[PDB]
């Protein structure tokens, strides 16, 4: 005849405590295996003492007063406080404390459900401020790039080695017959290339990536019918899915 | 029954969903569910009792996960396993499950107790935070690779300046225009020493006045360390946000008046 609730508290993964308020200083009279494992204390090392022994230097004094006022008022309380393991390792202890009254209405026990939320209040929180930091830097480093190609008027383009997706500057879109807003793929450039230069272009474009800079020159017939001679100095960014960089310029004058 | 059972109360008041089943009854039905469990699933108390815990399951739920629990229960062994379940509304969620067998003194199986936890949006949050960091790491590194490539290949006199501080960065072409050495530290004052005194006041004021994110141009005369007089044009713009940064492109336009 085993008590299923006793066994539930016994076998749960979540730390639980029970204190007897009728004794002085309201000491711990029970601690499930989960609690002893989290804090690293043995059973005989936590019995008989108040739960304030888990506190330390990083423990917010304001958090302690809240718990004190709740216990003195015999009222429940949920709070996140900084506690310490036997080794010294600090951890965020999500505290859920509930008073237990008898039939008459007198206080009989205090029970609590401790939960280690260190990875939420300490790990996730910094990963949110770390990610936000990267966003600024990413947006900035791009703002420098976009500003240079604009005021220096450079036909700058990028190309994904596999998908063939591209980005083009204002100058690059003027060299070809492109509009400032339309999406640009490697195929929309290939459509402008003269018939005789096409095979040379796509073979160089789909050639095995090397971190070395290379030059390539081909002719295009723009969408208005104007034949233009282009020169391009390109370089591939090594990776699993490389990004090809390239600066194109119109050299039709004096071929 | 004057005094309450603290263990009973602990399970009652906890925010962790907990179930108790009686394996002596057919198909091992639920005989208890704390208020925590009823809020998670959205079922009433009388809508859970007498049922097996498989009613939370449905489509998308891996049948391999079920057989793992099935074999664990049959062997009277504890088991930790995540699984897909369905709350009353139909909303699917991930159920972190911790089941433990309860034996008496004789070794006779009496009960099963469990801990339930909703870890759907929890695991989903971190699997997107670790894929987001990888992308932004590559992007920043590559957008930095793009910048240096353009400046070098296109021979641009490009400089950056922390507006408040005054510390500057200079490209190879930028240093050749003013007449700097490729490895000396460059401050805004270092440039001012070369600017002619007639145009010197007009330069500092224009650089000082505009902290906004509005583009502006300025042209002045300088004299290098060797004495060469050069007319310059600088097109600059400051990036508003936290510690400001002034970007500027300068080209030598030594052409006759
Ligand atoms: C059941 C129960 C469990 C408690 N568990 C913790 C705990 O895990 N960590 C902690 O810092 N305080 C815990 N406390 C609160 C402390 O025992 C103590 O009441 C609090 O630090 C204020 O003590 P003070 O009034 O002497 O300053 C718990 C209190 C109760 C009643
Ligand atoms: C105490 C206890 C709690 C359980 N809780 C769940 C649960 O929350 N979700 C679930 O899918 N299965 C849960 N199960 C397992 C199911 O009740 C069922 O035994 C298991 O899915 C295999 O049953 P089947 O092979 O007939 O499909 C629990 C089992 C026990 C003993």
Numbering used by the authors:
A (entry chain A): 19 to 273
B (entry chain B): 17 to 273
Give me lines lifted from the publication on this model.
LOV-HK is a blue light photoreceptor from Brucella abortus, a pathogenic α-2-proteobacterium that can be transmitted from cattle to humans causing brucellosis. The LOV and PAS domains are connected through a long linker helix denoted the Jα helix, while the HK domain belongs to the HWE family.
We collected 22 crystallographic data sets by subjecting the LOV-PAS crystals to various dark and light conditions at room temperature before freezing. Although the dark and light crystals belong to the same space group, they show small yet consistent differences in their cell parameters. It is highly possible that the FMN tilting results from the widely reported light-induced adduct formation between the FMN-C4a and Cys69-Sγ atoms, which is not fully resolved in our electron density maps. Specifically, the LOV domains undergo partial separation across the dimer interface in both the AB and CD dimers, which is also evidenced by the increased intersubunit distances in the light-minus-dark difference distance matrices. Partial separation between the LOV domains results in a destabilized or altered dimer interface between the N-terminal parts of the Jα helices. Instead of moving with their respective LOV domains, the tethered Jα helices in both the AB and CD dimers move together sideways perpendicular to the helical spine, resulting in asymmetric responses between the partner subunits. Although these motions observed in the LOV-PAS crystals are small in amplitude due to lattice restraints, they are compatible with the Jα tilting captured by the light LOV-PAS-HK structure, where the helical tilting is coupled to unwinding of the helical spine, eventually leading to a large rotation of the PAS dimer relative to the LOV dimer.
